[PDB]
């Protein structure tokens, strides 16, 4: 199983209420544990931010974030502003960086955008730190493992 804990990210100078007609919760909503960070007004500048989280627990933590692949180079400037958008993730053993791939696609559930997810396991008493310029699907809740379990794939009923 999985027990969640809030990572406590505050934001100022940007919008956090991105939503879509594909995550339909009595209207247009988004992922529950994620926040779609946007820019205040359309085409405005996204300010570069840095947000850390320290795994204060004894089990290892599971940090999950997303990258927003806009439909064009124009829509990316609409949501986050002109400029190259860049997300940088890093912990005591993790060192990567992510860039969105804005460009034409076919339609999937009537949308041509994509949102792709990445994950890393933060060690206990470690610190994850995000720096980002935009196009970042931020997390709100780290996940923790409860114990031991089995996992199968089937097409028959339980008993």
């Amino acid at each position, epitope marked *: 199983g999985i027990d969640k804990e809030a990572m406590g990210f505050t934001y100022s100078g940007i919008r956090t209420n991105g939503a879509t*007609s594909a995550c339909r919760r009595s209207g*247009s909503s988004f992922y529950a544990e994620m926040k779609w960070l946007l820019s205040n007004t359309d085409n405005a500048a996204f300010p570069q931010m840095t947000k850390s989280y320290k795994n204060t627990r004894k089990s290892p933590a599971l940090i999950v974030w997303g990258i927003h692949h*806009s439909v064009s180079t124009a829509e990316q400037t609409k949501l986050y502003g002109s400029g190259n958008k860049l997300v940088t993730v890093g912990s005591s053993n993790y060192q990567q960086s992510f860039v969105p791939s804005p460009g034409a696609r076919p339609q999937v559930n009537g949308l041509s955008g994509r949102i792709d997810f990445h994950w890393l396991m933060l060690n206990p008493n470690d610190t994850v730190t995000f720096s980002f310029n935009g196009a970042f699907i931020a997390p709100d809740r780290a996940s923790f493992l409860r114990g031991k379990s089995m996992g199968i794939q089937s097409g028959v009923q339980v008993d």
Partner: antibody
Amino acid sequence: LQLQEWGAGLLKPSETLSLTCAVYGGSFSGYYWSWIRQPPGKGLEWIGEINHSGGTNYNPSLKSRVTISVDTSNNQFSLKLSSVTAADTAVYYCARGVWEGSGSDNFDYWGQGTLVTVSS
Amino acid sequence: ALTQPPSVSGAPGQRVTISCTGSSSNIGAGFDVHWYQQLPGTAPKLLIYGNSFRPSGVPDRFSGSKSGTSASLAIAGLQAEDEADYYCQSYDSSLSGVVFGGGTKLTVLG
């Protein structure tokens, strides 16, 4: 769905067009609520929108004139423009635009529109 | 910056096309084009959305498509209840806002 627009219908230039529009069910925070005008001759002009949180998305053409607000407790929202001119004579619809973005990708279930004549 | 023809004719049942000519700042970008039907006096109903998708209670007669910098609506099986004004609508980036067309006056014959 219910979508009712009401307000000052007969004004002269330099006055301030104030309208407002109320709803049924389908409440705020599911969608972006928008004001879209239409001069009686021809055309269809988007003028602004706003969500349950009060976040605005204005037309920059009409910005510095448009001010859009939301009575979330009474489930209605109001339009305040502007230092009005004569070319603002139009049928004004409020409409529910579906929240995609940051934005209002399409509009489903428009209101019925109230005519506003700003002749002299 | 969305150009539609003023008028299109057509006999009952025949197929007719309405063109939504756009620039590279609106349809040329990744933005989708929708359509709206405005019957006399009535307010516009939502028609084709997402360039090809139609909401509940819209017949197969109405079929939307999009190619490059233009879009097109198609009506097959014309009836009297189809005589109306039709508007295409998308989003423009250089103007930072959504944009409608001029409208097309569908006249069914008879």
